[PDB]
Design a protein around this ligand. Sequence first.
Ligand SMILES: Nc1nc2c(ncn2[C@@H]2O[C@@H]3COP(=O)(O)O[C@H]4[C@@H](O)[C@H](n5cnc6c(=O)[nH]c(N)nc65)O[C@@H]4COP(=O)(O)O[C@H]3[C@H]2O)c(=O)[nH]1
Length: 285
Amino acid sequence: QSLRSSLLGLRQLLRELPGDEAPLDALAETVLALLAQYGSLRIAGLYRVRYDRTPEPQPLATLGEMPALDADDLLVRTCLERGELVSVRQAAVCVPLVDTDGRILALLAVEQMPFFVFNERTFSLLAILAGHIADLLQSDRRALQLADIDAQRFSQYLKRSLLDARDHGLPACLYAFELTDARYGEEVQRLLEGSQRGLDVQLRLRNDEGRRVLLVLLPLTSAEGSQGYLQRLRILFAERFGQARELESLGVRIRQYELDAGNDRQALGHFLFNECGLNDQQVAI
Ligand SMILES: Nc1nc2c(ncn2[C@@H]2O[C@@H]3COP(=O)(O)O[C@H]4[C@@H](O)[C@H](n5cnc6c(=O)[nH]c(N)nc65)O[C@@H]4COP(=O)(O)O[C@H]3[C@H]2O)c(=O)[nH]1
């Protein structure tokens, strides 16, 4: 998907960043360009938002003939107080960039976009992109948390995918591969690890029965995509192990959870903490 590829591009730029520089500053032009692309924006600005939810007037990046952000514009204030996209529908749109913790990192202020995209469809896409960008900027904070980087990333991406589903009806899939045959477990796990692609993230765990469980989250992925992933995995497994071998004959038990705003609130817990035999110390947020 174009969104996934856009986010992968930005993530890679963030990984290629020298390391000393503040992420929002160094990639401000890119962030604005991305938001401009998806919103068909013509005049807009990107601003840093302080901890107390007040905006920094000095623009990080501008598009078109950008007029200065004044004192307390009603749209800017409502946006930052709600932590949500606000438009003057019914000085066009304000989009906050909010991480999975609810921290407003930045503000997109749009002065001009074509009226034919001044609608809920485009607003939703702007909001989706803003949330994902905000998450990507928070990688400079992992250095002060105890959990392994892979655990922090998995947690963040999972929460974002839960938010995507709840707020925007966007699809994602969780797979749990339970490795029940200890002869094959290590090599099966290594093959699963090597298969990781794009925004997918994995967690390597041991469940309450002492078995290897590899969790894989597939963000922004349709049901057709999630089935495509398994078809690709089966081809890889066939290459690696016998043609006369299936994932299942190597001891792999596959459990799948499709993220959806229809699923009951207790469902993910049942899946991970009962079915997969995991606990809240292993997976949370
Ligand atoms: N989340 C997730 N979904 C998966 C994965 N593997 C397969 N899929 C799903 O199954 C479709 C077909 O994958 P394919 O046969 O590898 O066919 C792919 C593959 O030939 C190529 N492609 C896409 N991304 C990559 C990549 O990161 N590396 C390589 N080498 N090829 C890619 O483009 C074709 C279509 O890609 P998509 O549009 O992404 O469409 C993908 C995607 O919807 C996965 O590891 N994670």
